Write a protein that binds this ligand. Structure first.
Ligand code: MSS
Ligand code: MSS
Lengths: 365, 363
């Protein structure tokens, strides 16, 4: 399957093209430098990408800020005057790990959606303006405000109900201090593929909440009742419809997976590495096992600490005999949350973080 | 753009020569890490052919000056350890333009007139030299230097010492030195020293040997031209000689990176990059009036370590006019940038705060 027009610049050999809206990073392509190369970063769109014309005048891009004491519309040019913040986060789809839930289906049980393994995730550095600074410039939040609600800038088709298609998401207002209106990713102007010219980055939260080409940010008393917030991206049992009484895919859980080696290794000393994060919290420690979870050893963190929303690279130096190993990692966050062996089933297949499913088969020769 | 860097971003680079590409001041970004396609280039000799990347894991490195000396492949090196570190990769020439501006009368200085773009901050990943040396029994008794040899093919007939890119640094750097196969998450490019590079954190660019084919623990510095007489700190009109200081440790330095030319009157975000070389940057001051008044700046983004640089920013409310933006950094040991750097003949190691001032026209 060929790389779509809007991501022709990406690295075809590093990606699994599930659909034109769905590209997964290969497990062997994450690297050990923490930061995921831009041309290898995964893609997940719910609707078609806007035209490249929206990047012609980046500084002219408009964002309606409401739910504040002094509401008005500000340009990216203006936003650039109000502040500057840089932060590393784990950008991951709630769908990441869905394949593993599908593997657990018995009988006539069925689950739709992209069968992501581990490649629907990356760690990237964002740069932009803190939402707090933007809200404080406009007098602060309106009294009684409970949510940050961001609206994707895609053109909606005329005639149809906009709420059925709009990419609009709501997160609690306690995230205000963390939220970034970002125009830059990994040192470059933000690409169209990843939400340029401006993206609402919500650290620690799942991909869906990080709104590409954000054209509106509202401090609201209620969640948006858009389809994508009200019934979609909800955690429910098999056979249940989604509904707003259920937990939405917000905070990311503690998670990890092994990234290297991916298939083969020579007998003797082998460096086993991977990535680990705690979502809202930093990863405190990681254990690695070469025998599918029977025996565990403490791993070392590799590289610098990019913050509690980022991931760490970890490594275990293992001396291995000839054979077929089953490499798995189990991470713990700073609050004591640890990955389970398996994740409790849910109907849409969101938020997998089990350690057994994503095991790497290492043939040691 | 030359063949070996055709993948780079032409609009982000100033092409001085086929061996010399400078990053534009407006292209550093505020994410700390310098985009690979925008990273500067400085070669002393022609780049090897792209064929050396065909078999990366098969690339050979002669390790000597150890108890049990032998040649190891990149494949083997990958088994011995793993390390990741962010460093400031900067040419000793960076800032040479500013030294040339200080020349009076019939004084002359050769070399690329770099301003501030002969530098980047990048994440390396590879194997610690210490682990490689420990696997081979440790350093030979009496070893004083880490000497690395560039893998370029030398022309036959000519004295190899006149052209070889071979550099020596003190052995106290052993714990920091990385034999790196990866940069910013990707396999290391040919342009930046792939398939394997000797990264010496805190030291100037010249010491970070591309396509390293030999690493020796030696009792003496290599007497190669590039080490013995070149890259030495001397006065105007003096020849270089090995009694003089070599361009080793980087001094505390900074420069403003944004905005680069224009801004609207009112609130303006003034940002830049700062590092202490061997030491972390502790603090940065920014001035909008060419050094008459100073204000403390904030650090922006995460701390990538003592060898890296920090992004800093000052939020300034500015009236209409023409400002002169300058930054002055201090390291964790109290070393601070001077206004100007003492002159030296080859124009190495500029770190003054006045010369690299940005002219901001506020409308
Ligand atoms: N505007 C917008 N935004 C947005 C969207 C769309 O569609 N639109 N998607 C989501 C999702 S869903 Mo699941 O949870 S993941 C995800 C993400 C992805 O990212 P990238 O593509 O950059 O990777 O994004 C996010 N944001
Ligand atoms: N092998 C080799 N390496 C090498 C060389 C040569 O020539 N060769 N150069 C130096 C120098 S000098 Mo003055 O100090 S700066 C510098 C650097 C740069 O890097 P990039 O190009 O990658 O950026 O490199 C380094 N390394």
């Amino acid at each position: 399957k060929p790389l779509p027009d809007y991501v022709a610049w990406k690295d075809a050999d590093a990606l699994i093209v599930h659909s034109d809206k769905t590209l997964e990073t290969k497990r062997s392509e994450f690297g050990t430098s923490i930061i995921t190369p831009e041309e290898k970063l995964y893609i997940r769109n719910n609707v078609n990408t806007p035209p490249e014309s929206i990047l012609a005048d980046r500084d002219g891009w408009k964002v309606e800020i409401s739910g504040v004491k002094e509401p008005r519309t500000l340009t990216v040019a203006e936003l650039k005057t109000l502040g500057l913040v840089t932060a590393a986060t784990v950008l991951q789809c709630s769908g990441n790990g869905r394949k593993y839930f599908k593997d657990q289906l018995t009988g006539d049980q069925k689950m739709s959606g992209t069968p992501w393994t581990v490649g629907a995730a990356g760690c990237v550095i964002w740069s932009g303006v803190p939402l707090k600074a933007v809200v404080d410039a406009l007098g602060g939040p309106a009294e009684g405000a409970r949510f940050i609600t961001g609206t994707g800038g895609e053109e909606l088709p005329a005639g149809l109900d906009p709420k059925l298609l709009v990419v609009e998401r709501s997160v609690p207002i306690s995230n205000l201090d963390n939220v970034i209106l970002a125009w830059e990713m990994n040192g470059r102007p933000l690409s169209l593929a990843h939400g340029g010219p401006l993206r609402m980055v919500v650290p620690g939260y799942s991909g869906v909440n990080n709104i590409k080409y954000v054209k509106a940010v509202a401090m609201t008393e209620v969640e948006t009742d858009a389809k994508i917030q009200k019934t979609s991206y909800r955690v429910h049992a098999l056979g249940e419809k989604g509904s707003p009484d259920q937990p939405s895919v917000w905070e990311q859980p503690v998670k990890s997976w092994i990234t290297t080696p991916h298939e083969a290794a020579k007998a003797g000393q082998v460096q086993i590495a991977g990535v680990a994060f705690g979502g809202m919290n930093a990863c405190k420690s990681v254990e690695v096992s070469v025998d599918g979870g029977q025996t565990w050893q403490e791993a070392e963190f590799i590289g610098p600490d990019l913050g509690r929303f980022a991931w760490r690279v970890f490594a275990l130096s293992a001396d291995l005999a000839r054979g077929t190993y089953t490499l798995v990692s189990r991470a713990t966050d700073t609050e004591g949350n640890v990955q389970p062996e398996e994740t409790e089933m849910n109907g849409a297949g969101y938020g997998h973080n089990g350690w057994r499913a994503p095991a790497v088969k290492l043939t040691v020769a």
